């Protein structure tokens, strides 16, 4: 496949960034794209092969040394760089082929990191009214007070992640939208059969993965450093 790390990165001005792109498909051609919100994809760097080094869009540099690796580097970071970065490769075709893309990186460059906050997660159990009415049970999860917007919320039932019966807000809400830098809130729903919920041996866990600072980063504030971390909330099925 084609891989990229990190998915989310928030960093201060002046620091050096390196973005990872790797493929086991043994493709010779590889591409880097910069995509702003509601923006078209922009070719930034590309490589024909294993020494090949500038795309159609104009500070970053790329390094092709070993076939599988095509990392991208920003020597000195600036807010201007904030954007999404996609990497791609190409298959065999008439001498571009089929283009494969990675998950991309959401890059956020802030001048000050004092605003970054970890989320608070809470689970709310199904109402009795809904159960008897619809013979169904909906749980709601809330993640709040988090900045920046980098977050991944997931549901785990009896230890295994579940994608079915799950709905997550496409976009998070600003808590104070009048403010440019504002902590967020995000909700999700998991809906299961009533009897399923009514089994007490059933475990439900809402997990939010927050992408914050690192131990390496400097923190002068009173509260604990808002590092990358997992915040969870859980509920056990209720027997009526």
């Amino acid at each position: 496949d084609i891989y990229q790390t990190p998915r989310y990165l928030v960093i201060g001005t002046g620091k050096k960034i390196t973005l990872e792109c790797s493929q086991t498909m043994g493709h010779d051609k590889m591409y880097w794209y910069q995509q702003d919100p509601g923006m078209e994809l922009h070719l930034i760097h590309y490589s024909y092969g294993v020494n090949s080094t500038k795309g159609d869009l104009s500070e970053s540099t790329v390094s092709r040394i070993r076939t599988e690796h095509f990392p991208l580097t920003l020597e000195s970071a600036r807010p201007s760089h904030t954007s999404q970065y996609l990497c791609a490769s190409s298959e065999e075709g008439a001498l571009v082929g089929t283009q494969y893309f990675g998950p991309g990186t959401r890059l956020l460059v802030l001048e000050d990191l004092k605003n970054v906050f970890p989320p608070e997660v809470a689970v709310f159990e199904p109402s009795e009214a809904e159960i008897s009415h619809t013979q169904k049970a909906t749980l709601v999860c809330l993640a709040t007070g988090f900045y920046p917007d980098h977050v991944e919320l997931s549901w785990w039932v009896n230890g295994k992640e579940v994608h079915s019966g799950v709905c997550t807000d496409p976009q998070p809400l600003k808590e104070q939208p009048a403010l440019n830098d504002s902590r967020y809130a995000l909700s999700s729903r998991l809906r299961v059969s009533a009897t399923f919920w009514q089994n007490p041996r059933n475990h439900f866990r809402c997990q939010v993965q927050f992408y914050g600072l690192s131990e390496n980063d400097e923190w002068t504030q009173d509260r604990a450093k808002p590092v990358t971390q997992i915040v969870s909330a859980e509920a056990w099925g209720r027997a009526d």
Binding site: P103, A129, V140, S164, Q171
Partner: protein
């Protein structure tokens, strides 16, 4: 721009068909491809075409290429919720060393569940004790629910939920506040139908 897409966006119910348009001034022409980009994720190659092949098929997607009029169409059959995404027409051009790609602005497609039996209701979810939540659910798709900041009360956008084993789909929206807050307050008469279950 040398790559043009039509329409800008559209909304269809699940199970129905739609056609997307692409027109290009790119010269000299080489090949034509359609990408599907889900929200927040990376583009996925669907079909690639050249002047020689006027048609290509990938699953429920079928692409057409008229090189004479410089136009291409993507036809989705029996649409599904997972079809909601931006659709990008990419045009390739001949080159001195190798290649160039022209990405057009995508066509936004949104697929809604077809709700045969609506059962709109508003429930209050038991407080975590660790703000309380209200749940407006089972309403049909036409219903418009958006975000609201009045005052310390919050409301989210509607979201489709698919229970695959029961072949069931439902829309929901959530509202919460720390305050006076009651569920009949969060969702007022606009917009909720005249028949809505409250306990």
């Amino acid at each position: 721009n040398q790559v043009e897409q039509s329409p800008q966006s559209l909304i269809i119910l699940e199970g129905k068909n739609c056609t997307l348009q692409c027109n290009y001034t790119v010269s000299p022409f080489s090949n034509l491809r359609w990408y599907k980009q889900d929200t927040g994720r990376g583009p996925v190659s669907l079909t690639i075409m050249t002047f020689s092949e006027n048609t290509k098929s990938n699953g429920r997607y079928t692409a057409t290429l008229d090189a004479d009029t410089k136009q291409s169409s993507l036809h989705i059959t029996a649409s599904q919720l997972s079809d909601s995404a931006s659709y990008i027409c990419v045009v390739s051009d001949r080159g001195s060393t190798l290649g160039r790609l022209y990405f057009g602005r995508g066509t936004q497609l949104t697929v809604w569940p077809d709700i045969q039996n609506p059962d709109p209701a508003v429930y209050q979810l038991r407080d975590s004790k660790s703000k309380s939540v209200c749940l407006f659910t089972d309403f049909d798709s036409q219903t418009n629910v958006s975000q609201s900041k009045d005052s310390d009360v919050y409301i989210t956008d509607k979201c489709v939920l698919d229970m695959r084993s029961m072949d069931f789909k439902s829309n929901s929206a959530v509202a919460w506040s720390n305050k006076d807050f009651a569920c009949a307050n969060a969702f007022n008469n606009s917009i909720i139908p005249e028949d809505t279950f409250f306990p």
